[PDB]
mmCIF file of C-alpha atoms in Angstrom:
data_model
loop_
_atom_site.group_PDB
_atom_site.id
_atom_site.type_symbol
_atom_site.label_atom_id
_atom_site.label_comp_id
_atom_site.label_asym_id
_atom_site.label_seq_id
_atom_site.Cartn_x
_atom_site.Cartn_y
_atom_site.Cartn_z
ATOM 1 C CA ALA A 297 26.894 100.370 214.631
ATOM 2 C CA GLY A 298 29.922 101.646 212.690
ATOM 3 C CA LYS A 299 31.533 99.908 209.695
ATOM 4 C CA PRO A 300 35.122 98.708 210.026
ATOM 5 C CA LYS A 301 37.563 100.668 207.864
ATOM 6 C CA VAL A 302 40.062 98.465 206.005
ATOM 7 C CA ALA A 303 43.242 99.628 204.270
ATOM 8 C CA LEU A 304 44.604 97.666 201.267
ATOM 9 C CA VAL A 305 48.277 98.509 200.777
ATOM 10 C CA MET A 306 49.743 97.288 197.504
ATOM 11 C CA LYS A 307 52.941 97.576 195.532
ATOM 12 C CA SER A 308 53.312 99.144 192.141
ATOM 13 C CA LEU A 309 50.411 100.985 190.648
ATOM 14 C CA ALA A 310 52.144 100.751 187.296
ATOM 15 C CA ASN A 311 51.685 96.946 187.401
ATOM 16 C CA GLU A 312 48.401 95.622 186.050
ATOM 17 C CA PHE A 313 48.546 92.843 188.626
ATOM 18 C CA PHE A 314 47.773 95.394 191.325
ATOM 19 C CA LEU A 315 45.319 97.351 189.242
ATOM 20 C CA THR A 316 43.438 94.045 188.824
ATOM 21 C CA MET A 317 43.738 93.438 192.547
ATOM 22 C CA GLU A 318 42.467 96.953 193.341
ATOM 23 C CA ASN A 319 39.508 96.616 191.012
ATOM 24 C CA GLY A 320 38.577 93.319 192.665
ATOM 25 C CA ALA A 321 38.741 94.787 196.146
ATOM 26 C CA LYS A 322 36.712 97.832 195.153
ATOM 27 C CA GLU A 323 34.063 95.682 193.482
ATOM 28 C CA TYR A 324 33.903 93.585 196.624
ATOM 29 C CA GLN A 325 33.420 96.655 198.789
ATOM 30 C CA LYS A 326 30.696 97.956 196.479
ATOM 31 C CA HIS A 327 28.725 94.699 196.739
ATOM 32 C CA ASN A 328 29.193 94.802 200.511
ATOM 33 C CA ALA A 329 29.092 98.563 200.978
ATOM 34 C CA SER A 330 27.353 98.386 204.347
ATOM 35 C CA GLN A 331 29.827 95.839 205.806
ATOM 36 C CA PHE A 332 33.052 97.832 205.574
ATOM 37 C CA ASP A 333 34.784 100.881 204.095
ATOM 38 C CA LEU A 334 37.932 100.380 201.989
ATOM 39 C CA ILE A 335 40.999 102.588 201.498
ATOM 40 C CA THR A 336 43.364 101.426 198.717
ATOM 41 C CA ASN A 337 46.926 102.606 198.144
ATOM 42 C CA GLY A 338 49.945 101.593 196.135
ATOM 43 C CA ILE A 339 53.432 102.863 195.434
ATOM 44 C CA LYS A 340 54.997 104.447 192.371
ATOM 45 C CA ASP A 341 57.193 101.475 191.457
ATOM 46 C CA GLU A 342 58.004 97.961 192.679
ATOM 47 C CA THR A 343 60.983 98.949 194.810
ATOM 48 C CA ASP A 344 59.637 101.950 196.710
ATOM 49 C CA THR A 345 59.742 100.251 200.094
ATOM 50 C CA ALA A 346 60.249 103.615 201.845
ATOM 51 C CA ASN A 347 56.944 104.993 200.580
ATOM 52 C CA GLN A 348 55.061 101.786 201.281
ATOM 53 C CA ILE A 349 56.201 102.105 204.887
ATOM 54 C CA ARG A 350 54.970 105.697 204.853
ATOM 55 C CA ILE A 351 51.575 104.580 203.604
ATOM 56 C CA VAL A 352 51.206 102.078 206.438
ATOM 57 C CA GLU A 353 52.221 104.744 209.001
ATOM 58 C CA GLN A 354 49.580 107.051 207.487
ATOM 59 C CA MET A 355 47.048 104.217 207.835
ATOM 60 C CA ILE A 356 47.960 103.906 211.530
ATOM 61 C CA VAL A 357 47.219 107.595 212.153
ATOM 62 C CA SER A 358 43.853 107.381 210.373
ATOM 63 C CA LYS A 359 42.959 104.654 212.906
ATOM 64 C CA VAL A 360 41.847 102.102 210.317
ATOM 65 C CA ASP A 361 40.635 98.847 211.877
ATOM 66 C CA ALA A 362 42.568 96.520 209.635
ATOM 67 C CA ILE A 363 45.428 96.626 207.146
ATOM 68 C CA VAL A 364 45.793 94.157 204.307
ATOM 69 C CA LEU A 365 49.373 94.455 203.123
ATOM 70 C CA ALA A 366 51.246 93.156 200.019
ATOM 71 C CA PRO A 367 54.747 94.052 201.223
ATOM 72 C CA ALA A 368 57.408 95.443 198.872
ATOM 73 C CA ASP A 369 60.139 93.900 201.067
ATOM 74 C CA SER A 370 59.665 90.742 203.189
ATOM 75 C CA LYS A 371 61.864 92.056 206.026
ATOM 76 C CA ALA A 372 61.706 95.827 205.829
ATOM 77 C CA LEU A 373 57.946 96.160 206.297
ATOM 78 C CA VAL A 374 57.961 94.174 209.553
ATOM 79 C CA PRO A 375 58.686 97.069 211.925
ATOM 80 C CA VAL A 376 55.707 99.138 210.801
ATOM 81 C CA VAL A 377 53.469 96.047 210.872
ATOM 82 C CA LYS A 378 54.524 95.637 214.501
ATOM 83 C CA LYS A 379 53.641 99.323 215.030
ATOM 84 C CA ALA A 380 50.206 98.705 213.551
ATOM 85 C CA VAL A 381 49.556 95.567 215.576
ATOM 86 C CA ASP A 382 50.655 97.206 218.821
ATOM 87 C CA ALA A 383 48.127 99.983 218.013
ATOM 88 C CA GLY A 384 45.304 97.453 217.953
ATOM 89 C CA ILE A 385 45.000 97.155 214.172
ATOM 90 C CA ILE A 386 44.451 93.732 212.622
ATOM 91 C CA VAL A 387 47.073 93.082 209.925
ATOM 92 C CA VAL A 388 46.739 90.438 207.245
ATOM 93 C CA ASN A 389 49.629 89.675 204.906
ATOM 94 C CA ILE A 390 48.914 88.883 201.274
ATOM 95 C CA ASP A 391 50.879 88.067 198.066
ATOM 96 C CA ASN A 392 54.425 88.197 199.389
ATOM 97 C CA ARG A 393 55.029 86.639 202.754
ATOM 98 C CA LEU A 394 56.764 88.628 205.474
ATOM 99 C CA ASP A 395 59.890 86.953 206.728
ATOM 100 C CA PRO A 396 58.868 84.438 209.425
ATOM 101 C CA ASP A 397 62.137 84.713 211.334
ATOM 102 C CA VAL A 398 61.902 88.481 211.498
ATOM 103 C CA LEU A 399 58.279 88.065 212.630
ATOM 104 C CA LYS A 400 59.187 85.392 215.229
ATOM 105 C CA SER A 401 61.767 87.760 216.638
ATOM 106 C CA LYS A 402 59.265 90.505 217.405
ATOM 107 C CA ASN A 403 56.826 87.987 218.848
ATOM 108 C CA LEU A 404 54.494 88.834 216.006
ATOM 109 C CA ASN A 405 51.744 86.768 214.419
ATOM 110 C CA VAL A 406 50.519 87.773 210.976
ATOM 111 C CA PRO A 407 48.123 85.530 209.029
ATOM 112 C CA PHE A 408 49.061 85.000 205.382
ATOM 113 C CA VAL A 409 46.770 84.761 202.371
ATOM 114 C CA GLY A 410 48.489 83.924 199.121
ATOM 115 C CA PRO A 411 49.926 81.284 196.816
ATOM 116 C CA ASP A 412 52.642 78.721 196.986
ATOM 117 C CA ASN A 413 54.908 80.405 194.464
ATOM 118 C CA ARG A 414 57.303 77.438 194.221
ATOM 119 C CA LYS A 415 54.512 75.141 193.045
ATOM 120 C CA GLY A 416 53.174 77.950 190.848
ATOM 121 C CA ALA A 417 56.502 78.596 189.105
ATOM 122 C CA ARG A 418 56.998 74.806 188.832
ATOM 123 C CA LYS A 419 53.797 74.544 186.782
ATOM 124 C CA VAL A 420 55.075 77.218 184.361
ATOM 125 C CA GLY A 421 58.559 75.711 184.271
ATOM 126 C CA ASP A 422 57.151 72.220 183.584
ATOM 127 C CA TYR A 423 55.219 73.400 180.541
ATOM 128 C CA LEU A 424 58.370 75.023 179.161
ATOM 129 C CA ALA A 425 60.390 71.873 179.848
ATOM 130 C CA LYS A 426 58.132 69.917 177.493
ATOM 131 C CA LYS A 427 59.213 72.266 174.685
ATOM 132 C CA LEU A 428 62.918 72.134 175.485
ATOM 133 C CA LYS A 429 65.390 69.327 175.710
ATOM 134 C CA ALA A 430 68.046 68.067 178.071
ATOM 135 C CA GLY A 431 71.163 70.233 178.128
ATOM 136 C CA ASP A 432 69.354 73.345 176.881
ATOM 137 C CA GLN A 433 70.659 76.583 178.428
ATOM 138 C CA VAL A 434 68.122 78.883 180.102
ATOM 139 C CA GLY A 435 68.179 82.071 182.181
ATOM 140 C CA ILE A 436 65.960 83.081 185.082
ATOM 141 C CA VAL A 437 64.880 86.700 185.382
ATOM 142 C CA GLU A 438 64.014 87.073 189.069
ATOM 143 C CA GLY A 439 61.889 89.515 191.054
ATOM 144 C CA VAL A 440 63.217 91.688 193.913
ATOM 145 C CA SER A 441 65.658 89.236 195.526
ATOM 146 C CA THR A 442 64.686 90.109 199.116
ATOM 147 C CA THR A 443 61.118 88.941 198.638
ATOM 148 C CA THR A 444 59.846 85.538 199.495
ATOM 149 C CA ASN A 445 57.758 85.347 196.347
ATOM 150 C CA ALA A 446 60.717 86.193 194.092
ATOM 151 C CA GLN A 447 62.866 83.529 195.755
ATOM 152 C CA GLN A 448 60.213 80.874 195.622
ATOM 153 C CA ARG A 449 59.446 81.472 191.941
ATOM 154 C CA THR A 450 63.096 81.189 191.108
ATOM 155 C CA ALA A 451 63.237 77.946 193.101
ATOM 156 C CA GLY A 452 60.161 76.518 191.299
ATOM 157 C CA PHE A 453 61.704 77.454 187.959
ATOM 158 C CA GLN A 454 64.982 75.791 188.974
ATOM 159 C CA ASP A 455 63.053 72.656 190.064
ATOM 160 C CA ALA A 456 61.412 72.396 186.661
ATOM 161 C CA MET A 457 64.653 72.868 184.747
ATOM 162 C CA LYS A 458 66.486 70.272 186.896
ATOM 163 C CA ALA A 459 63.708 67.717 186.475
ATOM 164 C CA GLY A 460 63.842 68.167 182.705
ATOM 165 C CA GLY A 461 67.602 68.128 182.334
ATOM 166 C CA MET A 462 67.976 71.804 181.289
ATOM 167 C CA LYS A 463 70.842 73.940 182.525
ATOM 168 C CA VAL A 464 70.207 77.277 184.275
ATOM 169 C CA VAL A 465 73.206 79.374 183.263
ATOM 170 C CA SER A 466 72.178 82.735 184.752
ATOM 171 C CA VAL A 467 69.912 84.080 187.499
ATOM 172 C CA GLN A 468 69.568 87.862 187.747
ATOM 173 C CA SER A 469 67.006 90.250 189.177
ATOM 174 C CA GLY A 470 64.883 92.421 186.947
ATOM 175 C CA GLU A 471 63.315 93.875 190.134
ATOM 176 C CA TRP A 472 59.772 93.113 188.879
ATOM 177 C CA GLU A 473 60.081 95.834 186.228
ATOM 178 C CA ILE A 474 59.748 95.852 182.444
ATOM 179 C CA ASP A 475 62.847 97.841 181.695
ATOM 180 C CA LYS A 476 65.153 96.224 184.282
ATOM 181 C CA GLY A 477 63.786 92.832 183.029
ATOM 182 C CA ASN A 478 64.631 93.904 179.487
ATOM 183 C CA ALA A 479 68.152 94.915 180.468
ATOM 184 C CA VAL A 480 68.783 91.556 182.173
ATOM 185 C CA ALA A 481 67.263 89.508 179.331
ATOM 186 C CA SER A 482 69.424 91.411 176.844
ATOM 187 C CA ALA A 483 72.549 90.751 178.873
ATOM 188 C CA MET A 484 71.706 87.044 179.114
ATOM 189 C CA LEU A 485 71.089 86.724 175.359
ATOM 190 C CA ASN A 486 74.384 88.494 174.722
ATOM 191 C CA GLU A 487 76.234 86.297 177.245
ATOM 192 C CA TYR A 488 74.701 83.053 175.967
ATOM 193 C CA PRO A 489 74.363 82.828 172.190
ATOM 194 C CA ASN A 490 72.872 79.357 172.682
ATOM 195 C CA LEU A 491 70.218 80.433 175.202
ATOM 196 C CA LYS A 492 66.914 78.621 174.647
ATOM 197 C CA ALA A 493 64.555 80.243 177.152
ATOM 198 C CA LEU A 494 64.036 83.031 179.622
ATOM 199 C CA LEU A 495 61.991 82.189 182.701
ATOM 200 C CA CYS A 496 60.611 85.400 184.212
ATOM 201 C CA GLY A 497 59.299 85.919 187.700
ATOM 202 C CA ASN A 498 56.430 88.146 186.510
ATOM 203 C CA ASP A 499 54.707 89.164 183.303
ATOM 204 C CA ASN A 500 56.153 92.690 183.343
ATOM 205 C CA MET A 501 59.663 91.255 183.280
ATOM 206 C CA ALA A 502 58.490 88.818 180.591
ATOM 207 C CA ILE A 503 57.321 91.793 178.474
ATOM 208 C CA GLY A 504 60.823 93.166 178.890
ATOM 209 C CA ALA A 505 62.291 89.785 177.865
ATOM 210 C CA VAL A 506 60.024 89.591 174.773
ATOM 211 C CA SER A 507 61.443 92.983 173.681
ATOM 212 C CA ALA A 508 64.996 91.783 174.258
ATOM 213 C CA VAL A 509 64.414 88.585 172.269
ATOM 214 C CA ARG A 510 62.963 90.607 169.362
ATOM 215 C CA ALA A 511 65.888 93.069 169.476
ATOM 216 C CA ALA A 512 68.301 90.110 169.220
ATOM 217 C CA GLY A 513 66.468 88.678 166.199
ATOM 218 C CA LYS A 514 65.592 85.617 168.245
ATOM 219 C CA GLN A 515 61.778 85.826 168.072
ATOM 220 C CA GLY A 516 60.653 82.250 167.615
ATOM 221 C CA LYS A 517 63.966 80.767 168.804
ATOM 222 C CA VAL A 518 63.993 81.681 172.511
ATOM 223 C CA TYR A 519 61.009 80.857 174.676
ATOM 224 C CA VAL A 520 59.682 83.284 177.270
ATOM 225 C CA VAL A 521 57.508 82.400 180.266
ATOM 226 C CA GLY A 522 56.107 84.718 182.907
ATOM 227 C CA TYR A 523 53.752 84.841 185.852
ATOM 228 C CA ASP A 524 50.554 86.886 186.662
ATOM 229 C CA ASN A 525 48.405 86.523 183.542
ATOM 230 C CA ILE A 526 48.052 90.287 182.985
ATOM 231 C CA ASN A 527 46.001 91.469 180.015
ATOM 232 C CA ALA A 528 49.096 92.798 178.284
ATOM 233 C CA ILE A 529 50.407 89.221 178.090
ATOM 234 C CA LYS A 530 47.364 87.810 176.301
ATOM 235 C CA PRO A 531 48.154 88.981 172.768
ATOM 236 C CA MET A 532 51.631 87.581 173.354
ATOM 237 C CA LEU A 533 50.317 84.126 174.337
ATOM 238 C CA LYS A 534 48.101 84.256 171.231
ATOM 239 C CA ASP A 535 50.822 85.192 168.747
ATOM 240 C CA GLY A 536 53.492 83.054 170.393
ATOM 241 C CA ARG A 537 55.790 85.760 171.818
ATOM 242 C CA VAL A 538 55.155 84.262 175.302
ATOM 243 C CA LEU A 539 54.745 80.516 175.875
ATOM 244 C CA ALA A 540 53.100 80.400 179.309
ATOM 245 C CA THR A 541 52.209 82.394 182.376
ATOM 246 C CA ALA A 542 50.204 81.649 185.545
ATOM 247 C CA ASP A 543 47.148 83.134 187.142
ATOM 248 C CA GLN A 544 47.616 83.649 190.891
ATOM 249 C CA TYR A 545 44.335 85.491 191.268
ATOM 250 C CA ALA A 546 45.147 88.971 192.481
ATOM 251 C CA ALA A 547 41.583 89.986 193.223
ATOM 252 C CA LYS A 548 41.033 86.780 195.213
ATOM 253 C CA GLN A 549 44.088 87.461 197.386
ATOM 254 C CA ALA A 550 42.875 90.924 198.304
ATOM 255 C CA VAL A 551 39.265 89.864 198.846
ATOM 256 C CA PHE A 552 40.233 86.864 201.001
ATOM 257 C CA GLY A 553 42.680 89.102 202.846
ATOM 258 C CA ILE A 554 39.921 91.629 203.557
ATOM 259 C CA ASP A 555 37.517 88.818 204.594
ATOM 260 C CA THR A 556 40.133 87.368 206.935
ATOM 261 C CA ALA A 557 40.459 90.762 208.641
ATOM 262 C CA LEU A 558 36.713 91.381 208.832
ATOM 263 C CA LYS A 559 36.090 87.906 210.283
ATOM 264 C CA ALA A 560 38.669 88.586 212.991
ATOM 265 C CA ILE A 561 37.024 91.939 213.713
ATOM 266 C CA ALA A 562 33.546 90.378 213.775
ATOM 267 C CA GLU A 563 34.665 87.993 216.506
ATOM 268 C CA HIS A 564 36.776 90.588 218.361
ATOM 269 C CA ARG A 565 39.890 88.434 217.906
ATOM 270 C CA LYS A 566 43.338 89.592 218.919
ATOM 271 C CA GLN A 567 46.164 89.635 216.380
ATOM 272 C CA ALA A 568 48.012 86.946 218.376
ATOM 273 C CA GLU A 569 44.983 84.711 217.855
ATOM 274 C CA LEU A 570 45.151 84.724 214.053
ATOM 275 C CA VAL A 571 45.063 80.248 203.603
ATOM 276 C CA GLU A 572 46.642 79.037 200.376
ATOM 277 C CA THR A 573 45.187 80.537 197.231
ATOM 278 C CA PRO A 574 45.549 78.613 193.973
ATOM 279 C CA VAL A 575 47.800 79.110 190.969
ATOM 280 C CA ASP A 576 46.883 77.863 187.481
ATOM 281 C CA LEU A 577 48.948 77.518 184.356
ATOM 282 C CA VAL A 578 47.844 79.723 181.459
ATOM 283 C CA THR A 579 48.830 79.007 177.857
#
């Protein structure tokens, strides 16, 4: 009897988060090589929605049995998901949740595997708050603003700052990227000479913010927090350039996404018939 073929469709291949995710998925397939085949794909940067859509369309022609998708845009990927589901493919959503209203309006059910990013960001924000004081000015460097996970991290960060008495003076998108993150951080430091921290929606933007802080001669005076716990951030936690990040377990999301799809396939479930993963503070 034939193995199901599962497609894992990710965002930016530049981003270690997804390389970590990909490695996890591939290791999982290797251990379970007789259970399923795995096709992995990503896009060239964090904002290449168009190409991600193309990848999913290419997965629909190859007649894969399931697609596990980390969508680059929470609304824009919904049409091609519908296309996939109507073609009898099981789709599981990971990482960044597709917009529920847009889903509800195509009569579409898509199971989600991923974290509560508001609680996750709140953990990171809370640790920072302990180091700051009431009235301290901070800026939030946000992911792609049309993604659920970007919005929810910003909200968690805001929750933490409110609860501590800090003042968020700026919220701007660094579009999940190092250099756009850097540009935003630099603008915020220039705008606010009294800025005390930069709260970044992912580690890549945090790396950008660390560069901006250094370039402003503010190393040691402006805290930076991120999210993802990528390897590149570890020397920065160790030497103090970054105060905290969070592990949201990339490999787990992909593996549990794949398992969700395979379980559905094992039981011959229909899409219409169809999981919070944890986030831990890292310092």
